């Protein structure tokens, strides 16, 4: 019996239960976005604004249902409308992480027919982050 650790084992939604994505694995996800005609976009946040929190609810009556702070992150430039070139997305990942080397950065894609984000995963975490585990240390 292995025990799933409650310390410091923070996750990051889609794909965070897999081993960290290789560059080839990231490129394959980008190919998927383009193959389907979705709109790629990058978003980022400083460490303090990375995980869901409750601080604004201090201002509320009994209306906190499905309200959380830090769901919105900051948009990198604009969604890449009309983008049909995976290499363009990969170059924006490089540009974004270069400008914000200490930020969390996620790649997302929008579908304008359903008007919803249709995919997303983390592409950078700050190297100072220690609130997460390697795949083989998630259980003990």
């Amino acid at each position: 019996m292995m025990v799933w650790t409650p310390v410091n084992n923070k996750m990051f939604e889609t794909f965070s239960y897999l081993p960290p994505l290789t560059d080839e694995q990231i490129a394959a996800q980008v190919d998927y976005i383009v193959a389907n005609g979705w709109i790629p976009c990058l978003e980022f946040a400083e460490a303090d604004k990375a995980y869901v929190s409750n601080e604004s609810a201090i201002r509320f009556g009994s209306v906190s249902c499905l309200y959380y702070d830090n769901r919105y992150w900051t948009m990198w430039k604009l969604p890449m409308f009309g983008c049909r070139d995976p290499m363009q997305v990969l170059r924006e990942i490089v540009a974004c992480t270069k400008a914000f080397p200490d930020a969390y950065v996620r790649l997302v894609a929008f579908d304008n027919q359903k008007q919803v984000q249709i995919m997303g995963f983390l592409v950078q975490r700050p190297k100072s982050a220690r609130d997460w585990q390697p795949a083989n240390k998630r259980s003990v």
Binding site: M2, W4, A28, C65, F121, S139
Partner: protein, 465 residues
């Protein structure tokens, strides 16, 4: 035309094979089995009459109004291939017949009395064409798929749920204990069993409190938004509302309701409350199979699913295809589209008898639940795509290492399958390989895979097209 007292054939008034249906008419497809000596035209006409304006003998009061304006009309009859005494009778109902926003009223006319007529041996409502003009009278679901994903901040994969077990008999604190351990391992949701309401072994408000502690603990631990469908199903509307109110005041995301055992009137009220207070509403279809199992008699689930979409729910159970409960693949894919999509073309190969235009009513999240485990993951992802919640009750709480490892195994399997699909892999063929690959770096998945390796649910299907 004077009033003539006495009995005459229904078909003289209610069988209109040349009628051109109006775009505002509600249409019904009935699988009809007449008694010997009852012409299908008369049987169809009887169904149309006694679900609309007519009774067994001529009434004088018809003359004060316009029967042409109000009558239901059997406008077409199809023989059923492979059956000597089965017909699809098509009935058109004018929109004027229905109370705006009332699924209860729609069912009362269309399925109220006709299933008990001596003149027929069996009757099954297969489909309903709900016209935009009637759809527009309904509040519909509190949120719907897009809004749900947006409030949860969850995209790019199926959602994961889990019914706590044993069904009954756990204390409130043990419920929260099980919930915390499930959520912290990677599941998005857990839930009360459909029959967990308020009972001597566990009173509802104690459960809501302990579960709330568990939701917030797992959320803080994982950094992912968590929920647990707290059951509002109750004996009275007043108790149901008290439970919804408590969830609101605890700030938690989601409640559930058993829409058929609680009923459409209670359900519609609850859905409205959820819209007004921003609570998600998970719908459990308890008792549906009493109604929808048999091919010859009852109401097909696709109609029960449309009815729920109209009455209101953010989630509705859809079956698994591969699990312990029945649901044939093509039948299921058909009603899943009817639950999620805005516009669904007629397609008899999937049991869709009518083109259905939902006129922007929000889509309902299908929930695949019941007798499923890690090895089913490739098929589930292939069948449902991302816009579904996949639930593993026994498939989590039956993991040899406990709830958290159980949750992790399911979450690993889901994400591996999702990644593989995204990479161009064929889940129908390579699914076993995807799971086996993930087993190499996930001991939690490997343990789950070992326990349930031989377990399949393959039986002759009753509800066939």
């Amino acid at each position: 035309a004077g009033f003539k007292a006495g009995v005459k054939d229904y078909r003289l008034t209610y069988y209109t094979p040349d009628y051109v249906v109006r775009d505002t008419d509600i249409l019904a497809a009935f699988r009809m089995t007449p008694q010997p000596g009852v012409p299908p035209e008369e049987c169809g006409a009887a169904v149309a009459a006694e679900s609309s304006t007519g009774t067994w003998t001529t009434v004088w009061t018809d003359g004060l109004t316009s029967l042409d304006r109000y009558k239901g009309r059997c406008y077409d009859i199809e023989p059923v291939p492979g059956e000597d005494n089965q017909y699809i009778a098509y009935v058109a109902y004018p929109i004027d017949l229905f109370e705006e926003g009332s699924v209860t009223n729609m069912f009362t006319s269309i399925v109220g009395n006709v299933f008990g007529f001596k003149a027929l041996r069996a009757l099954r409502l297969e489909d309903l064409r709900i016209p935009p003009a009637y759809v527009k009278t309904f509040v519909g679901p509190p949120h719907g798929i897009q809004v749900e994903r947006d409030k949860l901040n969850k995209y790019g994969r199926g959602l994961l749920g889990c019914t706590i077990k044993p069904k009954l008999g756990l204390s409130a604190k043990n419920y929260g204990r099980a919930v915390y351990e499930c959520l912290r391992g990677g599941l998005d949701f857990t839930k009360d069993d459909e029959n967990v309401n308020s009972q001597p072994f566990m009173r509802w408000r104690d459960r809501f409190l302990f579960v709330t502690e568990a939701i917030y603990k797992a959320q803080a631990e994982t950094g992912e938004v968590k929920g647990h469908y707290l059951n509002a199903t109750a004996g009275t509307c007043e108790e149901m509302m008290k439970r919804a109110v408590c969830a609101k005041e605890l700030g938690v995301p989601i409640i559930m309701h058993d829409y058929l055992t609680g009923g459409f009137t209670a359900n519609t009220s609850l859905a409205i409350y959820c819209r007004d207070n921003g609570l998600f509403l998970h719908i459990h279809r308890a008792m549906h199979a009493v109604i929808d199992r048999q091919r010859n008699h009852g109401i097909h689930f696709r109609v029960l699913a449309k009815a729920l979409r109209m009455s209101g729910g953010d989630h509705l159970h859809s079956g698994t295809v591969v699990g312990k409960l029945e649901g044939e693949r093509e039948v299921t894919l058909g009603f899943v589209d009817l639950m999620r999509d805005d516009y669904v073309e007629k397609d008899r190969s999937r049991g869709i008898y009518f083109t259905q235009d939902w006129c922007s009513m929000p889509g309902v999240m299908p929930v695949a639940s019941g007798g499923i485990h890690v090895w089913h993951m490739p098929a589930l992802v292939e069948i449902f795509g991302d816009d579904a919640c996949l639930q593993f009750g026994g498939g989590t709480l039956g993991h040899p290492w406990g709830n958290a490892p159980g949750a992790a195994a399911n979450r690993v399997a889901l994400e591996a399958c999702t990644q593989a699909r995204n990479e161009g892999r064929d889940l129908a063929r390579e699914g076993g390989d995807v799971i086996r690959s993930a087993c190499k770096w996930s001991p939690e998945l490997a343990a789950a895979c070992e326990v349930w390796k031989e377990i399949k649910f393959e039986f002759d299907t009753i509800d066939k097209l």
